[PDB]
Write a protein that binds this ligand. Structure first.
Ligand SMILES: [Mn+2]
Ligand SMILES: [Mn+2]
Ligand SMILES: [Mn+2]
Ligand SMILES: [Mn+2]
Ligand SMILES: [Mn+2]
Ligand SMILES: [Mn+2]
Ligand SMILES: [Zn+2]
Ligand SMILES: [Zn+2]
Lengths: 366, 163, 366, 163
DNA sequence: GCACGTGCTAGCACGTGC
DNA sequence: TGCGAAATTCCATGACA
DNA sequence: ATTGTCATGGAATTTCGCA
DNA sequence: GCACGTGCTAGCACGTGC
DNA sequence: TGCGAAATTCCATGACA
DNA sequence: ATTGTCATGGAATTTCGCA
């Protein structure tokens, strides 16, 4: 009853409107409002009340306000409700987000063949010839692809395959996901010896390896079609699949990967002859004209309710593998650096620096 | 008539025996006739078995119109005959005791024979490990007659391993 | 060389344009076209050629046409390409669809409490007190919900729970998914004795039980928040969760489920008193005014590339649980009856009648 | 003053002992004072233990302002005292040897006592199974004084089990 | 040696057939 | 230049994780 | 410390054969 | 008794810490 | 009727499967 | 023979206190 005494005396207090009659009854200070008569508790009591009505079900803004509304009234009640919701640790770490991620970037295509290799593992598959996994290697510019059968997705097996591959040429960058065979020390020491730079996707985000992941689909599709009504023995089909895909038209490019790598068809079925009367040199100059004039898509329009990150903003990381009835979000953290409008470095909950995709972040509410 | 191109004709032949490097004794030399580009696959025999095995690996990448080779056993067998016809490969043979390729291939084949024998001096016991280094070397070695490297004629680009 | 003889003589054949010179060379009949010179094979040879170029990689319309284009030309080549694609069994059963499902129906809300019960099981959960599952029962109109802890999701345990529930009232319809405890003979014989009608969702389609499935979320959320930083012993929290949710505002309704069931708040915290001076009869008449004037949403606008089903159309069912490298779609079947623009009865691959949601169907292409 | 309502006051009392039906001997009668609505929970004892157990089930549905009951042991213990205060329930007791409820409850309580004893004639050994049928019966039985059923006064709707 | 972090697909339960 | 048919391009969807 | 992709088939538009 | 159909969540592999 | 602040409603997103 | 839902918090609009 601090300033509540003043209002009872008829004095004016900024916020509470004057066309309403405020009184005293049963010890408590009330007000006569359209809905009915409501209690006006002192400011000291107000924090406690909002917490008692939230903790009923951990309700959000509107559901909380309606509870308190049944008994009480005061100015800007919601100001005090969101005040508690911003601090109640359990709600912030269990609640889902209602904000979309900003729209995808489409990175420029690598310019020349052998600039960027994208790699990734497939499986475990039905055992064929004692082989279980397939290491898949896609060249960025062409889309050309090599397939290797391994008995495990180890660094050891990944070494031996790239060794046979690299005899043809050596790439500038190799891009992988943070899979354990690809982040080993032994594998980095292998990249160092050959002068190749290693590049890693942000964790729990396969989109980033989308080039090789997309090629895995084409590989499973054709494998499947060729094993219909027959035991699933894939081993001896890998070289057939490698060849068919390498020579198959991307309809929006008008070219096959074989064509973007060599500029001329080999002795495969239905071969393009169109550049028949040209010397090699007139072909090779044409290939460079095509290679710089390929189709490339533009980033899509944002969602009407997306968010995009900023230095010093409060964000929370998606818990990688939460157990049942456990929260899906980590405690809040601060954005240190914004690498692009979809990639970010945070000071995590360890607290180390971590590089994450915004698809595993959410803006902290309030 | 029409200009020579890659994948038009590959030349192939066996080198060995050699010192027991990691359990192998021979090498299968493959050289594209217009590019001089070169693949090397080690084997434990100059047999038809080892030829198809290696060449399956190669022809799952690209496929030649023609193969040329001496009348060594492995190429003249009827097993290798039926392999070349399955895939649409026309076969060509030199005449006995008078080897014939071209200017470009005769020289390349020579170097391979020389660079190979050189590591058979410097690191003479374990050669199996050193092949990929050799192939890179041979495919980035500049040609006197034309003004580009096999790597350059094949991919229409520079290399990341200049030599 | 049937009608190809005529064209060589200069006669006109409907389809092939006359401003081009067609000749004979190396035994085959060619044509001189802008792109270059192309072979025109006899109609007898044409089916074989389109199949040879498809079987390279099982390519679709455009990728196939471009192969054949390198060597051949004839009128309406694509007519012959889609002809093969409509019949090639492997492509039809492995390929993905590019057509969206028609837009959802929002069924009218049940009118009075106890018209429709929606049920469903939760778990297995972390063992608490030797209890593993939770049977969840939601009343359509109110949203009111009862929770029961069971040691398994059996008919036996489902019997015993609904028996304690039904003492309060008996519902008209009980709606479940086709889960094995709910489709047992023993359970149907239980429904029969009490005069309740049983109703079943279409299989592999949880949306249909969306009312109870949505309530499972609210149940896990609050359970989670209340077990933060503490061992996950839920058993003794079930009655607390049942109560809090039953009395929590749906913001777009302005009411709690307790309120839509009884019309007045009991002795729970922050109780609504607003109808204090009314007799019971003035309350109960008000409750019916509210119950008929609740919010209800309208079906969303279709996708620009959706499909909606028709009797006698060719469709294919999504294989429920395909093994690896096996096709994801069943052989084509015919639509017998269209129950609503999102529900359909087919003569399947057994061939029995089956009732499916259009979300597990795709229009057969071609 | 203000009109009587549901959840305003519940009346509770024990019936038994009875024949050993499925291992139980008693029944806890709960009756809302304005609706006459009725819950019946069987027990194996007229103890404080069995009362809280049952009533926890009931008060996880709705919660009364007041409980009324005789001065039987179970209700006057200080254990049941602390249970009623945790949940905000005010307690009320009749005076010893002079039972008091209302017109409406005295009669309802009577029927329950009569319908119960009747199945104790017709199906006199196994009564545990028959309770839910009785509760439905009692909650759909029409009241003379008011012109609706307890089910009707509680949910503002008809029943699907008319009696 | 065993838990952790990152990458993947298996497997259990229930009620009903043969 | 203008018309109808044919060829060629547009682009939402869905699977790879 | 980094970033989605592209085969696919009905729809929508462009071109083309002819006069 | 064991495979099937419908409903659910577990679990294995690899390379590196302590 | 008209103004700025406050209260109240609008509605995309995401999890339940 | 059947069919998505609704809590949530910034944005967008409506109402309200005052003169
Ligand atoms: Mn991977
Ligand atoms: Mn020889
Ligand atoms: Mn279920
Ligand atoms: Mn008594
Ligand atoms: Mn992958
Ligand atoms: Mn469920
Ligand atoms: Zn909270
Ligand atoms: Zn096909």
């Amino acid at each position: 009853d601090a300033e509540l005494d003043q209002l009872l005396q008829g004095h004016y207090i900024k916020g509470y409107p004057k066309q309403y009659t405020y009184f005293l009854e049963d010890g408590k200070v009330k007000v006569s409002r359209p809905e009915g008569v409501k209690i006006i508790p002192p400011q000291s009591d107000r924090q406690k009340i909002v917490l008692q009505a939230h903790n009923l079900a951990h309700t959000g803004r509107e559901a909380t306000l309606l509870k308190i509304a049944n008994l009480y009234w005061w100015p800007n009640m919601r100001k005090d409700v969101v005040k508690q919701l911003g601090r109640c640790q359990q709600c912030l770490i269990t609640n889902a987000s209602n904000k979309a991620s900003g729209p995808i970037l489409r990175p420029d295509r690598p310019q020349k063949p052998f600039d960027k290799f994208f790699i990734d593992y497939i499986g475990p598959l039905p055992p064929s010839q004692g082989y279980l996994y397939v290491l898949v290697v896609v060249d960025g510019m062409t889309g050309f692809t090599w397939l290797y059968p391994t008995k495990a997705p180890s660094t050891s097996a990944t070494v031996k395959s790239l060794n046979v591959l690299t005899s043809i040429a050596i790439p500038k960058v190799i891009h992988s996901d943070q899979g354990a065979a690809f982040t080993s020390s032994t594998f980095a020491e292998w990249a160092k010896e050959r002068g190749i730079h290693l590049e890693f996707s942000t964790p729990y985000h396969p989109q980033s390896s989308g080039k090789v992941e997309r090629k895995n689909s084409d590989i499973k599709r054709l494998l499947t079609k060729l094993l219909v009504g027959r035991p699933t023995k894939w081993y001896d089909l890998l070289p057939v699949v490698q060849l068919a895909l390498n020579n198959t038209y991307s309809p929006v490019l008008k070219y096959t990967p074989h064509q973007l790598l060599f500029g001329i068809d080999s002795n495969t079925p239905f071969a393009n002859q169109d550049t028949l009367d040209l010397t090699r040199e007139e072909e090779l100059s044409l290939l460079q004209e095509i290679r710089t004039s390929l189709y490339h898509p533009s980033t899509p329009p944002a969602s009407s309710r997306s968010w995009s990150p900023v230095v010093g903003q409060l964000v929370q990381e998606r818990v990688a593998r939460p157990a049942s009835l456990r929260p899906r979000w980590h405690k809040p953290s601060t954005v240190l650096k914004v690498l692009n409008p979809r990639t970010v470095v945070i000071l995590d909950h360890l607290g180390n620096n971590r590089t994450v995709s915004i698809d595993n972040l959410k803006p902290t509410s309030h | 008539d029409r200009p020579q191109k890659p994948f038009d004709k590959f030349f192939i032949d066996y080198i060995g025996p050699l010192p027991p490097s990691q359990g192998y004794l021979y090498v299968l030399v493959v050289v594209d006739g217009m590019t001089g580009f070169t693949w090397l696959y080690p084997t434990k025999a100059p047999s038809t078995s080892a030829t198809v095995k290696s060449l399956n690996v190669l022809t799952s990448i690209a496929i030649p119109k023609v193969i040329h080779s001496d009348q060594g056993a492995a190429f003249t067998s009827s097993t290798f005959a039926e392999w070349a016809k399955e895939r649409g490969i026309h076969l060509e043979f030199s005449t006995p005791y008078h080897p014939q390729s071209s200017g470009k291939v005769e020289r390349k084949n020579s170097d391979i024979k020389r660079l190979l024998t050189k590591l058979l001096v410097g690191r003479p016991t374990k050669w199996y490990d050193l092949l990929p280094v050799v192939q890179l070397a041979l495919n980035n070695t500049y040609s006197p007659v034309l003004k580009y490297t096999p790597h350059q004629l094949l991919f229409g680009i520079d290399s990341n391993t200049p030599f």
